[PDB]
Design a protein around this ligand. Structure first.
Ligand SMILES: NS(=O)(=O)c1cc(C(=O)O)c(NCc2ccco2)cc1Cl
Ligand SMILES: [Ca+2]
Ligand SMILES: [Ca+2]
Ligand SMILES: [Ca+2]
Ligand SMILES: [Ca+2]
Lengths: 34, 341
């Protein structure tokens, strides 16, 4: 089966289907930043 | 009706990607995270009390064409949008709402107040801005409460002559349709943050059927993880060196295309467990985007108060995200500050 490894910079979207709304949008460059 | 609703969301999504692209200039090669709907919903609420070019500038900056969608349709669509998002969903927590903190001496129109309260999930609080420190704490604690403790200290600085604050908040908490087994999470795995540098993150791992695709035009992998109800997350992984090109291409049109092309099949998936936070001072950005008259001495908010006695002074957003084995919890808040006109 195909391997998908989210191990470098990625964009992220959270959407609600019934309204087709983007609730949150982002890019994760360094997931350990504080 | 749903035709109007889907138009609001498509326009809102293109605004989301355009603002995203502004952020990629403001804070380049850095984490980005915001709630587009929070920002859009706050500004639409402000526009309810605006008139003439002040009002039109706000909705045009949000992406709307008043020939295609007249002012009153925009108003109805957003009212529908907020209502639908807040409708109870089984084992999904999703709350979006507003709070208006109005100075003791302002003369708000009963119409505007009745409208926001009944049609736009708004609580109205008479606030004594003569104690600016207490007012800031009151607003920050309310936002904290409405975001289930997740958005702390939204307002860092409040102008001493503030006479109104409008806040929108969103809180989201959902379980994955397929939760990860924490016994399979690798405690320290490598994550590439630039060409020569990794950081260590817990890497969750599961083999499952997911909607996924490789976009052959944009050179990116798209992986969808469903929440158990009404909601999903999309992870977009550009091929090496292609993040900039993918960011330039994103639009509502991309999401409409992916909706068609995504296909469910087996994937050996590795996803990091992590939390991030971001804050944005949006005052100047919104001005640059076309919100001009709202800030000026000739601001027209004649629908908000009797005397048209205020103007916009500052705007800011804070958002937080946590992703782990069980699901996702995210929250956001938008702050609009007003002073005497
Ligand atoms: N509002 S939109 O035009 O950006 C949009 C539009 C649509 C649409 O299908 O028209 C849509 N479908 C659900 C989906 C897309 C990818 C994974 O789930 C989602 C969105 Cl966010
Ligand atoms: Ca790596
Ligand atoms: Ca299974
Ligand atoms: Ca584009
Ligand atoms: Ca496209």
């Amino acid at each position: 089966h195909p391997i998908i490894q989210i191990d470098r910079s990625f964009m992220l979207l959270i959407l609600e289907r019934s309204t087709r709304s983007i609730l949150f949008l982002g890019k994760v460059v360094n997931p350990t930043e504080a | 009706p749903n035709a109007t609703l889907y138009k609001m969301s498509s326009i809102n999504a293109d605004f989301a990607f355009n603002l995203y692209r502004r952020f990629t200039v403001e804070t380049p090669d850095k984490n980005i995270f915001f709630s587009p709907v929070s920002i859009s919903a706050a500004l639409v609420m402000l526009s309810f009390g605006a008139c003439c070019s002040t009002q039109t500038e706000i909705v045009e900056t949000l992406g709307f064409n008043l020939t295609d969608t007249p002012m009153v349709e925009i108003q109805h669509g957003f009212q529908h949008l907020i209502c639908s998002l807040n409708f109870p969903k089984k084992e999904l927590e999703l709350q979006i709402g507003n709070a208006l903190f109005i100075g003791k001496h302002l003369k708000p129109l009963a119409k505007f107040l009745n409208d926001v309260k009944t049609l736009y999930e708004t609580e109205v609080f008479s606030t004594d801005f003569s104690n600016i420190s207490a007012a800031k704490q009151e607003i920050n604690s309310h936002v904290e409460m409405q975001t289930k403790g997740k958005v702390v200290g939204l307002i860092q600085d409040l102008k001493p002559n503030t006479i109104m604050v409008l806040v929108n908040y969103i809180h989201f908490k959902a379980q994955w349709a397929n939760p990860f087994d924490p016994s399979k999470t690798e405690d320290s795995s490598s994550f590439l943050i630039d060409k020569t540098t990794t950081v260590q993150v817990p890497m969750m791992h599961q083999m499952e059927q997911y909607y996924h695709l490789v976009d052959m035009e944009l050179n990116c992998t798209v992986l969808q993880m469903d929440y158990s109800k009404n909601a999903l997350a999309l992870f977009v992984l550009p091929k090496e060196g292609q993040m900039e090109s993918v960011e330039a291409a994103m639009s509502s049109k991309t999401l409409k295309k992916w909706n068609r092309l995504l296909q469910k099949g087996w994937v050996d998936l590795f996803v990091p467990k992590f939390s991030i936070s971001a804050t944005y001072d949006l005052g100047a950005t919104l001005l640059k985007m076309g919100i001009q008259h709202a800030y000026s001495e000739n601001a027209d908010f004649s629908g908000l108060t009797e005397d048209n006695g205020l103007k916009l002074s500052n705007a800011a957003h804070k958002a937080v995200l946590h992703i782990g084995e069980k699901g996702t919890e995210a929250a956001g808040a938008m702050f609009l500050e007003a002073i005497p006109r």
